[PDB]
Coordinates of N, CA and C in Angstrom, one line a residue:
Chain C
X53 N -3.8 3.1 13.0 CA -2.8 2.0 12.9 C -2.0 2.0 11.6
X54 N -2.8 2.8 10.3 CA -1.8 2.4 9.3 C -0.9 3.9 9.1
X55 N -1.4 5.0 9.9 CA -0.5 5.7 10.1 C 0.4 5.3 10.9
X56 N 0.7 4.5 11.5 CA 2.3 4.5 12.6 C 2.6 3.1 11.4
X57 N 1.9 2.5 10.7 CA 2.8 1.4 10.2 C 3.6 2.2 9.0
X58 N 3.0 3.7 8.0 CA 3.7 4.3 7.2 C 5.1 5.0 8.2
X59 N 4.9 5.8 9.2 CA 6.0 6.2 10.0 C 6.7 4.9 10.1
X60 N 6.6 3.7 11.0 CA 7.5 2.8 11.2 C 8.4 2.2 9.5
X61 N 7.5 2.2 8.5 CA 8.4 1.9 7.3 C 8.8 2.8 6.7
X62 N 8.9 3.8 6.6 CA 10.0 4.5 6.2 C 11.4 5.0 7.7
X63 N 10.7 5.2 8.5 CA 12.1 5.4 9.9 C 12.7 4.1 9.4
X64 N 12.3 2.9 9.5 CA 13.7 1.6 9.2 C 13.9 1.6 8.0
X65 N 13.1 2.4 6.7 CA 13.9 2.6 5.3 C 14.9 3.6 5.2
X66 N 15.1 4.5 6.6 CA 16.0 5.5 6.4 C 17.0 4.7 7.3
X67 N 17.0 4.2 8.1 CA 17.7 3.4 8.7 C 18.8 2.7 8.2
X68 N 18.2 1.8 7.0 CA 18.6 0.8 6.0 C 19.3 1.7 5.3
X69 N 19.2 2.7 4.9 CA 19.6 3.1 4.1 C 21.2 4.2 4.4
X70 N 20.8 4.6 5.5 CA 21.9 4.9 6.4 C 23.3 3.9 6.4
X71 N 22.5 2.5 7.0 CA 23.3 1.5 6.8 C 24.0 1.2 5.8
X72 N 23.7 1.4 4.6 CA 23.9 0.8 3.5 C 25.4 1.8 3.2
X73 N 25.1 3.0 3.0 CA 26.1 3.8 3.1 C 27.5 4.3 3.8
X74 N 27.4 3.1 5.4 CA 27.8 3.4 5.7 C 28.8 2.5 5.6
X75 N 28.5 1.5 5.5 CA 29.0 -0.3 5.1 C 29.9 -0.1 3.9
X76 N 29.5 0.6 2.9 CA 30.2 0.8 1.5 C 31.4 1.9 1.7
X77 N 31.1 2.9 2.5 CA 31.9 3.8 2.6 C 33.3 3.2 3.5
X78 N 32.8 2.3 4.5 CA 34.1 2.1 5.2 C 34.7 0.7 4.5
X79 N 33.6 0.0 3.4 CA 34.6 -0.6 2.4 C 35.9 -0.2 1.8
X80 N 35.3 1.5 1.4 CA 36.1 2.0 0.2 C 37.3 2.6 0.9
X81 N 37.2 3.1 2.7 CA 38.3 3.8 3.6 C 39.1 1.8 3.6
X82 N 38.8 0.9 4.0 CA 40.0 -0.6 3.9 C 40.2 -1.1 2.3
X83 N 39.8 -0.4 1.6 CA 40.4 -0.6 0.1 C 41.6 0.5 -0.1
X84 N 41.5 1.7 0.7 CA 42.7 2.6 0.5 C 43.8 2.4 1.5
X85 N 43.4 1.7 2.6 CA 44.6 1.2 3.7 C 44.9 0.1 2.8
X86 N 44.2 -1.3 2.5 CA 45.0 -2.1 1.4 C 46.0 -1.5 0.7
X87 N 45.2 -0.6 -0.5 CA 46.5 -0.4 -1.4 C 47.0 0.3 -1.2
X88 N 47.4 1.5 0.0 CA 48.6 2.0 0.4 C 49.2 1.4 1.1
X89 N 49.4 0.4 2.0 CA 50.4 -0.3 3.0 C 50.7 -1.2 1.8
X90 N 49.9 -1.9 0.6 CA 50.5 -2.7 -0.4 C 51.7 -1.5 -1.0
X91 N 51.2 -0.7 -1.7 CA 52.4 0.4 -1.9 C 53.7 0.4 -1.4
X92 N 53.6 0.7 0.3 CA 54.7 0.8 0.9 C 55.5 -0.8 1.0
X93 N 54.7 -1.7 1.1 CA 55.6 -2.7 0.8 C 56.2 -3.4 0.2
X94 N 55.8 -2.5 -1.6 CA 56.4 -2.9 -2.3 C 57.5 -2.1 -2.5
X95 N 57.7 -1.2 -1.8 CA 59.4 -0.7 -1.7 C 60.1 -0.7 -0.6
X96 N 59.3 -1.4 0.4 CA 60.2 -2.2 1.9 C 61.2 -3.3 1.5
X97 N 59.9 -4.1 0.7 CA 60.5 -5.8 0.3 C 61.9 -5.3 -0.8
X98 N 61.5 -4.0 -1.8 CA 62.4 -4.4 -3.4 C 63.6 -4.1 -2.4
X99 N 63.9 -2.6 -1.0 CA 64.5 -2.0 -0.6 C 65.5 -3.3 0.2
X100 N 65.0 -3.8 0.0 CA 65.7 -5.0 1.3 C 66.9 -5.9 0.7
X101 N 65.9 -6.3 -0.7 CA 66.6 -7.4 -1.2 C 67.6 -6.8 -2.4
X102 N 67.5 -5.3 -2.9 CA 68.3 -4.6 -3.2 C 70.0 -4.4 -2.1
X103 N 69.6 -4.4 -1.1 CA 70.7 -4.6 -0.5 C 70.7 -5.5 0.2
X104 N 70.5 -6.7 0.2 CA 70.9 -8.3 0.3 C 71.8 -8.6 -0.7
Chain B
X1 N -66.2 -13.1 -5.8 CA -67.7 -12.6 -5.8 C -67.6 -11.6 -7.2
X2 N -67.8 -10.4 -7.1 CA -68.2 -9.2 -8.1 C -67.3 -9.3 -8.7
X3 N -66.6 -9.8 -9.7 CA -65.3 -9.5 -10.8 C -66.2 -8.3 -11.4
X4 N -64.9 -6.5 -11.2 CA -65.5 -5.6 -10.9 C -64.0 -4.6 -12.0
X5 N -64.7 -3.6 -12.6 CA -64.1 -2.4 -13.2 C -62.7 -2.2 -12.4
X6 N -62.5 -2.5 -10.9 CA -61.9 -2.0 -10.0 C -60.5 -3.0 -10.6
X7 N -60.9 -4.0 -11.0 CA -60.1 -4.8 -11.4 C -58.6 -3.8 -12.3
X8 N -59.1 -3.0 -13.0 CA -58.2 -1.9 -13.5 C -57.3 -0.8 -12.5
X9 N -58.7 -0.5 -12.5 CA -58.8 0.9 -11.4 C -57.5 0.8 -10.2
X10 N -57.5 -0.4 -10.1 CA -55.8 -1.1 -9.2 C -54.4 -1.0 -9.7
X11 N -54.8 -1.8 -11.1 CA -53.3 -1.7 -12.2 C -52.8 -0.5 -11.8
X12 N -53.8 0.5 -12.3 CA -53.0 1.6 -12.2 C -52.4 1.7 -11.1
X13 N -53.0 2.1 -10.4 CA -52.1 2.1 -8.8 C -51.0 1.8 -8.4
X14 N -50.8 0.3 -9.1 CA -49.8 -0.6 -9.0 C -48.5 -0.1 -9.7
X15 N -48.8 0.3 -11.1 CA -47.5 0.3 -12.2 C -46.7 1.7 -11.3
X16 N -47.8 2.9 -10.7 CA -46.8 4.0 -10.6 C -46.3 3.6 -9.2
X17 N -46.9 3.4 -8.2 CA -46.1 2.8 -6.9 C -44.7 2.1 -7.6
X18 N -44.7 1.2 -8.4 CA -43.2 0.4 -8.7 C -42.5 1.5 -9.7
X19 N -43.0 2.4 -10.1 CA -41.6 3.4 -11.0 C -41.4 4.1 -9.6
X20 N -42.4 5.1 -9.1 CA -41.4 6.0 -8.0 C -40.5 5.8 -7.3
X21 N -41.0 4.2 -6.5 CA -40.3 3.5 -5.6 C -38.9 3.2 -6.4
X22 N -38.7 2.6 -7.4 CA -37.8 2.1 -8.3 C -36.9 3.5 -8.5
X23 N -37.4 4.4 -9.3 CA -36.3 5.5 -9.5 C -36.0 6.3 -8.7
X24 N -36.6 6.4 -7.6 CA -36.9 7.7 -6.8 C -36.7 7.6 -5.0
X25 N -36.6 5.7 -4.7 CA -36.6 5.7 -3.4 C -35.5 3.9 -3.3
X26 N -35.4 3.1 -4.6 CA -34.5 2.1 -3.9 C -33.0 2.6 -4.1
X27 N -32.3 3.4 -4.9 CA -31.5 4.0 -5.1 C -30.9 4.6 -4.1
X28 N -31.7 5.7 -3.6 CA -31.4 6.3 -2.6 C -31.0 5.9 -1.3
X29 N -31.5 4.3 -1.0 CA -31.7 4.1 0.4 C -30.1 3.6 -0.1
X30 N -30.3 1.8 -1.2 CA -28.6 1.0 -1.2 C -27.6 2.1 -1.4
X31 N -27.6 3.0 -2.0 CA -26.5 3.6 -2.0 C -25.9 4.0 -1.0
X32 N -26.4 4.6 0.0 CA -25.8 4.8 1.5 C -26.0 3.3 2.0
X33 N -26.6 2.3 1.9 CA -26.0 1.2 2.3 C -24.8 0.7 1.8
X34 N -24.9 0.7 0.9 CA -23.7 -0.1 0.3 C -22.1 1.0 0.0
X35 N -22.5 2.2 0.7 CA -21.6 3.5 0.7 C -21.1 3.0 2.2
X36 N -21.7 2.9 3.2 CA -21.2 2.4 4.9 C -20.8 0.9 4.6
X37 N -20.9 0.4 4.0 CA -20.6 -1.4 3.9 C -19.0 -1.6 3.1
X38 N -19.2 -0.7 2.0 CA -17.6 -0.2 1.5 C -16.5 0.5 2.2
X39 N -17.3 1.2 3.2 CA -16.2 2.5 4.2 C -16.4 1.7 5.5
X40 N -17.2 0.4 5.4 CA -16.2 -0.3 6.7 C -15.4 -1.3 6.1
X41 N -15.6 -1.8 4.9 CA -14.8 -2.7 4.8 C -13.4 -1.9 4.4
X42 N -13.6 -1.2 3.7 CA -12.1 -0.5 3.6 C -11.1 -0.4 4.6
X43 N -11.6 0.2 6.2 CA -10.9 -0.3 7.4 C -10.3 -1.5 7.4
X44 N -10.5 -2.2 7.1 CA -10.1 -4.1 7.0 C -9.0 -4.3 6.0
X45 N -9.6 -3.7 4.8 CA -8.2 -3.8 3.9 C -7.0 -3.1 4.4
X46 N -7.3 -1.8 4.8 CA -6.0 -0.7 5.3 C -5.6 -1.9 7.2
X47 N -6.4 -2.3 7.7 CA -5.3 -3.1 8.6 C -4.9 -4.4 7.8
X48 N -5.5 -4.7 6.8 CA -4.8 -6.0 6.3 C -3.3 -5.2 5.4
X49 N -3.0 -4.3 5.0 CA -2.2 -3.5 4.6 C -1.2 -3.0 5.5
X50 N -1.5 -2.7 6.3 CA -0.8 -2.4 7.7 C 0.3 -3.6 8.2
X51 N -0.6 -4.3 8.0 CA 0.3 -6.2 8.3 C 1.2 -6.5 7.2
X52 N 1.2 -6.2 6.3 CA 1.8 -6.3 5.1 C 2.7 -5.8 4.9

């Protein structure tokens, strides 16, 4: 029994851990769509009202 | 009745019966008792560990 309780806690610590990585990583891929679509709109909006 | 020489002749008898037994035979037996009484209770800790 306390061998399948060491297998069961580490499979869900690699699990977790998987997780963790993966949550952060696709933070960091909507932190570069943020600040590139911010980028592009800040030369949509200046491009606009330059010629307004 | 007779308070008798034998009265000694026993002592002796007595004092070495309690060293052999003492160094030579209670030792031997508790240790394997209390050797099976530790390695079953250890089971109990490792499932209380298991739950844990």
């Amino acid at each position: 029994d306390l061998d399948l309780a060491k297998a069961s806690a580490t499979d869900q610590l690699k699990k977790a851990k998987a997780e963790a990585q993966v949550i952060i990583e696709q933070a960091n891929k909507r932190r570069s769509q943020i600040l590139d679509e911010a980028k592009a709109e800040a030369e949509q909006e200046r491009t606009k009202i330059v010629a307004q | 009745m007779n308070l008798n020489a034998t009265i000694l002749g026993q002592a002796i008898a007595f004092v070495l019966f309690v060293l052999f037994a003492m160094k030579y035979v209670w030792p031997p037996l508790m240790a394997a008792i209390e050797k099976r009484q530790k390695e079953i209770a250890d089971g109990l800790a490792s499932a209380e560990r298991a739950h844990k």
